[PDB]
Design a protein around this ligand. Structure first.
Ligand SMILES: CCCCCCCCCCCCCCCCCC(=O)OC[C@H](COP(=O)([O-])OCC(O)COP(=O)([O-])OC[C@@H](COC(=O)CCCCCCCCCCCCCCCCC)OC(=O)CCCCCCCCCCCCCCCCC)OC(=O)CCCCCCCCCCCCCCCCC
Ligand SMILES: CCCCCCCCCCCCCCCCCC(=O)OC[C@H](COP(=O)([O-])OCC(O)COP(=O)([O-])OC[C@@H](COC(=O)CCCCCCCCCCCCCCCCC)OC(=O)CCCCCCCCCCCCCCCCC)OC(=O)CCCCCCCCCCCCCCCCC
Ligand SMILES: CCCCCCCCCCCCCCCCCC(=O)OC[C@H](COP(=O)(O)OCCN)OC(=O)CCCCCCCCCCCCCCCCC
Ligand SMILES: CCCCCCCCCCCCCCCCCC(=O)OC[C@H](COP(=O)(O)OCCN)OC(=O)CCCCCCCCCCCCCCCCC
Ligand SMILES: CCCCCCCCCCCCCCCCCC(=O)OC[C@H](COP(=O)(O)OCCN)OC(=O)CCCCCCCCCCCCCCCCC
Ligand SMILES: CCCCCCCCCCCCCC(=O)SCCNC(=O)CCNC(=O)[C@@H](O)C(C)(C)COP(=O)(O)O
Lengths: 126, 170, 157, 178, 57, 106, 606
């Protein structure tokens, strides 16, 4: 009779054991977390409520996320055995599998047309 | 009507006589008489006005015909002049055969819609005609490819003649 | 704009000084900042934010990006385009995930098994076949008028 | 919504939150009003008889046990108010809460359609400019050089002054704009 | 086979006014409803059958 | 706990400026500055029927007769039901009746 | 032969007219909702005329209005196959749309986009009539997709709502899976019979059609929200209530069932298809009724009622009874339009309060809406001699007295009993007991624009099944010689379902809390299908997309393979060839060994 979490059904913040065994280190860690959150909120609020502003507020978080998801991957990519095996299988295995199934299907079709046991009913526009 | 029953056959309609057993009036007959008097009469009046304007300005147009150039079987290879002429002839005959198949399919659709639940029995001749023209079309034009040509059709026909000749040996 | 390479994302951090610089760049504490493991997948120094969707965030809070339920300047998850509110949810459920999987699979398998049971044990009425005249409607189903079928003869009872 | 959350939730705050959530799930289970009132009195009695706890370690243990019991006994489909998040009518009129700055981009014909309102709007913008300069100075003065910082904002501390960063609260669109 | 009588006993001294023949939850209530609908449904079938035997075709 | 005096004084000032903004959201009586009924059966349901129904009926009936029946297989219909004892309008024969119905129980 | 076609095309023209009026820049001068309501009622009259004509002569019509394109032997022409199904569904849909349009004119007041709302509803009716009266599969697909996209827009009407956008997207997804099935069937038919024409399909009746019937089954499952592809309909209740009613109660939900009714001559010759449709319909009606017993949002309850009755229709097509399925389509359109419209009046006068736990005393506080809600609930459960008695009872009769699956029979009877049970739950928790709403009374249901359509739909839900069923030409001969426990089975199961749910509601009234059980948890959480599937399929799909396709191939491995490897090879080789020391001694040594190599190569070539 216990709730069992998942990556897709995460454990509740009121049910985690890490909160009831709280420490002064964790309390102060949340204190500077709130301090950084408040500093960023104050900066965005000032830039938002400035009436001299005539353009959108640029977001360094969005810029960093877009560059990390777009342009940093190949500078930060190093070939390992694992990603080489994964890239080889993900680039070849589906191609080989679909080639095999298409070749058997088309070979069966061509042989059936050649020796006559497949009758085309009204296939006039292929 | 610009169509004719020689290429669009249609059996004569056999409607039954009305026999109203009930004493109630027929709203269908009342509404169609009223609808005729209010809609069909002005529409047909303006249509006769338009048709008399057509008769005042009557013009004629003709159906173009092409003479039969010699076929590709008597065309020398590499001589692109006669090959082009036979290829254009083959393309025109291809389009004519396509419209022939369209005519047959429309005839089959008309048969099925007319017969309704009797289409399995009364449309036997139409389905047989469709099957025959389907088999002929498959034997002459199928599997030619996107770049279908008179040369490709001739090669397919020659292969069919060779295989049926080998079948005719035994 | 005024965006330069020093605060733009970069290479995988090695030294504690480089880790502290990355945390300062990403506006995180040094202990809270944790990069992806160096397995060469192109993540770089981007932090490993916890894999929780945006439904976990407080809905009563006045977020800077209200649709995204995120503030301004805080680090963005690598899979935000997965974890937006229009997409995959990681919210806690009133019953466990394994319990839901077991119950759904059990219901599906139970229904399949009883459908097979009802298929091998069909229910009907204590009657014979439907009686049809004219050789079970030979001509009307599309039979050949020239070819005479086998005479299907029916009798009174 | 109008108050920023603190860094951490205190034990009293967590107990009150659990009490309110338990009562909401109690009424969702009970449906009928007399039944809900009876069982809400019972739950209030339980909270009262665990109220006078002095160890505070057993109080945290009792809070954890009560949270486990609540998560086991919660309604799968609890009652949610229509304006609450997850409700039926939540975020329904976000398609109609148009921000106030498109009125600047309105055409002079649509400007002339509403003269007095736009005159009041220009007066508000002038007040916004002056109060913005003054409140930038005030917020620069009020910020501590170092130490702990919260998301709360100071008020106006002298006559003729407006509170800092007042624009997006004062000129926010109506929750029922149409 | 463990001892769960003393926990089952305290599911029988609730002074809520629910009688002893329905105190076992909802399952005995459904059993009550089913036996109440089917003795009477049987009884009406018996009286109808006795009437059908008493008045022949 | 309750409101701190910093937020308590701030909120009353934000609420006070909120009433002023909402009062200014009202409209003066001149806003906005913009630049034969009979009955329903006699008028309202009459001109609609002779304009949105009768005129499109003329255009549709023009199309379905002089541009549809002139085409070969546009309007094709199933044959009508022919029962014994009926008379064909087009040809003129009478369909013979059925047999004697040997069973007349009900 | 001219008045019939003129009436059909005038229905279509009167539907097309308010769209051109909306684009004609006079909406600011006319009353667009009233104008469109009058247009729909006139279209209903001009659809009543061919209903009378077909009830007289039973003529089957096929009208080829426009020729679109001709490509070899395949000739795409815009045609309308005006049949029994087309005429009766057109009349029923036009009457329902007239009621819903008047209701929405009352309902969506204080909404600046009411003209856009009415235009969207009219466009949906145009696309649904195209889908209903379409003759070839291409026009069928045109209507199908117009229905789908208009459903998307009308679900996501409140575009500021993330839940509404999500529900609209997932409706698009499940309809797209159905579209893949329909496309498979359409492709097979074009390949094998050269046309999408239903007449050539009738001629295609005499061979193995397993692949196209499987595709049509997939399409019908996706459109009608059967098991596996169900939860998009209760998600689709996120939009406005007239949208919920008209869209997902009468017209959209019966489109795949209508498609299978259209392809019933192919369906009758495939026993595998009939068995799997019977099993699928029985499973989905049982599952949706199971959810509806413990759903608490009233729109969700009647949505699952709609889905369970779609499962019943799906079973009915599971036997060789397509006309019974279409009769139930008409009766169900009437019932769910009326029920949804009544619940919308409840919600609007209770100020957007949607779940039954905050209602009560509705019988005393809203006598008209309570009376109509009771009428709709009884006619849905199968009160005899109402509109639903002439379809639902015969469906029960057929499943009891024809050779089918035993488990499908048992769960269909159980689903009917539970249909009575959840109708009892609706009646109890809304119309009965003590009030639970917030105190401020804002009930005002005296508006004629609300009052009149409920009256019209009540007259429909009383008399339409009677009139239609005695005007049906006799097809699909039912059986009647059967014992009482198979004859009054529907009445017995409805009565015992009503009484069991009444007793259970009395137990909930009784002062005692009970322990929750996994059966009620399974029923309340929708069988765990939405949570489990809608979390595990998008997560794996998007994770596979980002972490394999984009990153691993394009940003890593194709980039490493072709261009950067070519650049690296050429850069290394140009460094190697231009790593010269600049010493003329080394240059002349190079020239000397070049001379020696030329001499050796000339000597070996000779
Ligand atoms: C015979 C006796 C020896 C047998 C033996 O030991 O075999 C092991 C050997 C692999 O050695 P390992 O133990 O994985 O090496 C890891 C290092 O020890 C430790 O790793 P490391 O970090 O020191 O190495 C860095 C990196 C060094 O960097 C690299 O290796 C760079 C990447 C090289 C190519 C990788 C191809 C696979 C990925 C394809 C992605 C998709 C492409 C588009 C679709 O190494 C790797 O990535 C490891 C994998 C090396 C694979 C070498 C394959 C050579 C043959 C290639 C044939 C053509 C492939 C397709 C080309 C298509 C062109 C259009 O071979 C095999 O396991 C079987 C493959 C045999 C060749 C085929
Ligand atoms: C067989 C059946 C085949 C078709 C099957 C189609 C199935 C799929 C249907 C998808 C419908 C998608 C949809 O909901 O679209 C909404 C969309 C606009 O709805 P909305 O969300 O309220 O947008 C309003 C604006 O946001 C705000 O604008 P507003 O509210 O102020 O409204 C002012 C109104 C004012 O309207 C205008 O100004 C009309 C503009 C065109 C004038 C053309 C004059 C030509 C004179 C010749 C002499 O403008 C509009 O409503 C939209 C303007 C753009 C419409 C463009 C449509 C194509 C025009 C093509 C013209 C070709 C001319 C050739 C020469 O409407 C359309 O796309 C057109 C109506 C639907 C399609 C046509 C009617 C059905 C098919 C009949 C056959
Ligand atoms: C919107 C979709 C409309 C589809 C039907 C279009 C009807 C008008 C049309 O294109 O007619 C074509 C016809 C000329 O074409 P045709 O007769 O083939 O040419 C040989 C004669 N020289 O041209 C004419 O007949 C010109 C005269 C037209 C008169 C008015 C026709 C009104 C038609 C109203 C019904 C339209 C279809 C209703 C159903 C729509 C469903 C979406
Ligand atoms: C007895 C026999 C019984 C037989 C049973 C057979 C069962 C067959 C079942 C077939 C279908 C299985 C897969 C269905 C996936 C549906 C996913 C879906 O609807 O996602 C919606 C979801 C959000 O929805 P949700 O969170 O539930 O609702 C909002 C509540 N706040 O998430 C989102 O909106 C995320 C946005 C979309 C993300 C991309 C999704 C791409 C999916 C590509 C799929 C490709 C393969 C399809 C194969 C189909 C095979 C039929
Ligand atoms: C699945 C299908 C498989 C089959 C098909 C595979 C082939 C597909 C088509 C080939 C595409 C090749 C693309 C080459 C260009 C991309 C690489 C590139 O541009 O690298 C840039 C780099 C110079 O970088 P740079 O700009 O100076 O510095 C950065 C900022 N300053 O550049 C360099 O360092 C050097 C660049 C050299 C020039 C590249 C283009 C010419 C290549 C000639 C190849 C000759 C091959 C035959 C040689 C003889 C036989 C071995
Ligand atoms: C649906 C089912 C829901 C089940 C919920 C079960 C909750 C019932 C269990 C309990 O009541 S255990 C309560 C544990 N709480 C405590 O021990 C808190 C006691 N500590 C204190 O400091 C208390 O004095 C207070 C009440 C928090 C102080 O607050 P004062 O009133 O300001």
């Amino acid at each position: 009779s216990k709730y069992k979490p998942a990556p897709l059904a995460t454990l509740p913040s009121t049910l985690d054991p890490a909160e009831y065994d709280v420490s002064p280190e964790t309390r102060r860690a949340q204190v500077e977390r709130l301090s950084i959150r408040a500093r960023l909120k104050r900066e965005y609020l000032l830039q938002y409520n400035d009436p001299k502003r005539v353009s959108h507020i640029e977001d360094p978080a969005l810029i960093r996320w877009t560059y990390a998801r777009s342009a940093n991957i190949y500078p930060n990519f190093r070939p390992t055995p694992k990603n080489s095996l994964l890239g080889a299988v993900a680039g070849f295995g589906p191609l080989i599998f679909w080639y095999y199934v298409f070749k058997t299907d088309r070979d069966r079709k061509e042989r059936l047309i050649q020796e006559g046991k497949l009758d085309r009913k009204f296939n006039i526009s292929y | 009507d610009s169509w004719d029953k020689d290429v669009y056959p249609e059996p004569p309609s056999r409607t039954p006589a009305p026999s109203p057993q009930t004493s109630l009036p027929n709203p269908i007959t009342y509404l169609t008489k009223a609808y005729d008097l209010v809609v069909d009469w002005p529409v047909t009046l303006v249509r006769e006005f338009i048709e008399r304007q057509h008769a005042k300005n009557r013009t004629y147009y003709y159906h173009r015909q092409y003479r039969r150039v010699p076929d590709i079987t008597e065309c020398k290879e590499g001589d692109v002049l006669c090959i082009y002429e036979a290829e254009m002839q083959w393309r025109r005959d291809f389009k004519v055969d396509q419209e022939i198949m369209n005519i047959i399919q429309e005839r089959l659709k008309a048969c099925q819609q007319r017969e309704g639940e009797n289409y399995q029995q009364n449309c036997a001749k139409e389905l047989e005609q469709f099957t025959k023209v389907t088999k002929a079309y498959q034997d002459r034009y199928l599997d030619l490819g996107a770049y279908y040509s008179a040369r490709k059709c001739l090669a397919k026909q020659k292969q069919r003649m060779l295989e049926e000749r080998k079948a005719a040996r035994q | 704009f005024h965006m330069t390479k020093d605060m733009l994302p970069g290479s995988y951090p090695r030294t504690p000084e480089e880790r502290a610089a990355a945390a300062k760049k990403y506006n995180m504490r040094v202990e809270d900042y944790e990069p992806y493991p160096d397995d060469g997948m192109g993540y770089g120094d981007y932090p490993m934010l916890p894999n929780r969707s945006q439904h976990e965030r407080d809905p009563w809070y006045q977020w800077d990006h209200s649709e995204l339920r995120m503030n301004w300047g805080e680090p963005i998850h690598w899979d935000l385009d997965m974890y937006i509110r229009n997409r995959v949810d990681t919210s806690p459920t009133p019953v466990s995930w394994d319990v839901m999987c077991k119950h759904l699979f059990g219901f599906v398998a139970f229904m399949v098994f009883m459908f097979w049971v009802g298929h091998v044990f069909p229910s009907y009425q204590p009657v014979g076949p439907k009686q049809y005249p004219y050789n079970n409607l030979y001509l009307e189903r599309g039979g050949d008028p020239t070819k005479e079928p086998e005479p299907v003869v029916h009798y009174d009872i | 919504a109008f108050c920023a959350p603190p860094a951490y939730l205190t034990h009293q705050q967590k107990v009150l939150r659990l009490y309110k959530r338990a009562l909401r799930h109690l009424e969702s289970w009970c449906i009928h009003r007399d039944k809900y009132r009876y069982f809400a009195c019972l739950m209030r009695a339980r909270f009262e008889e665990h109220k006078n706890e002095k160890d505070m370690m057993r109080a945290t243990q009792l809070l954890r046990e009560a949270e486990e019991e609540f998560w086991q006994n919660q309604h799968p489909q609890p009652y949610i108010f229509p304006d609450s998040p997850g409700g039926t009518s939540f975020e329904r009129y976000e398609c109609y809460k148009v921000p106030e700055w498109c009125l600047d981009y309105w055409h002079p014909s649509e400007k002339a359609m509403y003269p007095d309102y736009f005159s009041k709007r220009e007066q508000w913008k002038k007040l916004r400019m002056e109060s913005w300069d003054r409140e930038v100075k005030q917020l620069q003065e009020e910020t501590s050089p170092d130490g702990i910082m919260t998301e709360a904002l100071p008020p106006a501390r002298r006559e003729g002054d407006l509170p800092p960063l007042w624009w997006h609260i004062v000129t926010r669109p109506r929750e029922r704009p149409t | 086979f463990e001892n769960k009588v003393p926990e089952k006993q305290k599911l029988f001294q609730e002074d809520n006014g629910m009688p002893v023949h329905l105190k076992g939850g909802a399952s005995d209530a459904l059993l009550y409803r089913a036996t109440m609908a089917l003795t009477l449904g049987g009884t009406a079938y018996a009286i109808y059958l006795l009437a059908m035997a008493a008045f022949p075709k | 706990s309750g409101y701190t005096p910093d937020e308590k004084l701030r909120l009353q000032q934000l609420r006070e400026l909120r009433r002023r903004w909402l009062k200014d959201q009202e409209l003066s009586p001149r806003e906005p500055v913009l630049p034969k009924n009979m009955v329903f059966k006699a008028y309202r349901s009459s001109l609609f029927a002779v304009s949105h129904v009768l005129i499109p009926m003329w255009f549709v009936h023009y199309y379905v007769k002089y541009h549809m029946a002139t085409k070969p297989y546009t309007i094709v219909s199933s044959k009508p039901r022919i029962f014994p004892g009926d008379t064909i309008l087009e040809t003129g024969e009478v369909i013979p009746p059925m047999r004697d119905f040997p069973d007349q129980h009900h | 032969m001219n008045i019939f076609t003129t009436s059909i095309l005038l229905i279509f023209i009167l539907l097309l007219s308010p769209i051109l009026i909306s684009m004609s820049n006079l909406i600011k001068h006319i009353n667009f909702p009233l104008y469109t309501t009058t247009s729909i009622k006139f279209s209903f009259i001009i659809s009543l005329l061919p209903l009378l004509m077909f009830f007289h002569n039973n003529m089957e019509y096929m009208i080829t209005t426009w020729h679109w394109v001709t490509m070899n032997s395949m000739e795409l022409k815009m045609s309308f196959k005006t049949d029994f199904f087309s005429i009766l569904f057109t009349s029923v849909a036009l009457f329902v749309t007239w009621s819903i349009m008047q209701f929405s004119s009352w309902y969506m007041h204080s909404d600046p986009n009411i003209n856009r709302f009415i235009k969207y509803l009219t466009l949906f009716l145009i696309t649904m009539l195209i889908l209903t009266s379409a003759n070839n599969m291409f026009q069928l697909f045109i209507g199908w997709e117009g229905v789908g996209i208009m459903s998307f827009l009308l679900i996501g009407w409140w575009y500021g709502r993330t839940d509404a956008n999500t529900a609209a997207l997932q409706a698009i997804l499940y309809n797209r899976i159905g579209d893949i099935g329909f496309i498979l069937a359409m492709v097979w038919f074009s390949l094998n019979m050269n046309s999408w024409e239903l007449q050539q399909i009738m001629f295609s009746n005499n061979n193995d059609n397993l692949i196209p019937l499987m595709g049509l089954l997939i399409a019908a499952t996706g459109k009608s929200a059967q098991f596996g592809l169900h939860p998009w309909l209760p998600s689709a209740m996120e939009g406005p209530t007239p949208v919920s009613a008209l869209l997902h109660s009468s017209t959209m939900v019966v489109a795949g069932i209508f498609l299978l009714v259209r392809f019933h001559p192919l369906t009758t010759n495939n026993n595998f298809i009939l068995t799997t449709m019977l099993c699928l319909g029985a499973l989905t009606t049982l599952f949706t009724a199971i959810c509806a017993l413990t759903q608490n949002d009233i729109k969700k309850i009647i949505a699952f009622s709609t889905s369970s009755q779609l499962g019943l229709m799906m079973v009915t097509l599971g036997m060789n009874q397509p006309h019974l399925a279409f009769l139930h389509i008409c009766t169900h359109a009437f019932f769910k339009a009326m029920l949804f419209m009544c619940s919308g009046s409840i919600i609007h006068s209770l100020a957007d309060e949607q779940d039954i736990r905050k209602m009560g005393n509705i019988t005393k506080i809203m006598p008209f809406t309570s009376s109509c809600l009771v009428i709709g609930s009884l006619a849905l459960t199968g009160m005899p001699f109402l509109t639903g008695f002439y379809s639902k009872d015969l469906i029960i009769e057929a499943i009891n007295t024809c050779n089918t699956n035993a488990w499908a029979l048992l769960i269909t009877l159980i689903a009917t009993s539970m249909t009575a049970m959840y109708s009892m739950r609706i009646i109890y928790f809304v119309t009965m007991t003590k009030p639970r709403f917030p105190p401020l009374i804002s009930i005002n249901e005296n508006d004629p624009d609300l009052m009149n359509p409920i009256k019209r739909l009540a007259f429909g839900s009383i008399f339409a099944g009677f009139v239609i069923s005695y005007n049906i030409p006799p097809t699909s001969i039912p059986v009647l010689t059967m014992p009482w426990f198979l004859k009054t089975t529907a009445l017995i199961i409805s009565v015992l379902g009503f009484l069991i749910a009444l007793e259970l509601n009395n137990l909930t009234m009784k002062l005692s809390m009970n322990k929750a059980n996994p059966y009620s948890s399974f029923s309340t959480l929708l069988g765990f299908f939405p949570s489990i599937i809608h979390r595990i399929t998008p997560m794996k799909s998007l994770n596979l997309s980002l972490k394999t396709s984009l990153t691993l191939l394009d940003l890593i491995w194709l980039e490493k393979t072709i261009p950067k490897s070519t650049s690296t090879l050429h850069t290394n080789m140009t460094t190697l060839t231009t790593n010269q020391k600049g010493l003329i001694k080394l240059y002349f040594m190079s020239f000397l060994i070049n001379i020696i190599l030329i001499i050796i190569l000339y000597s070996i070539n000779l």
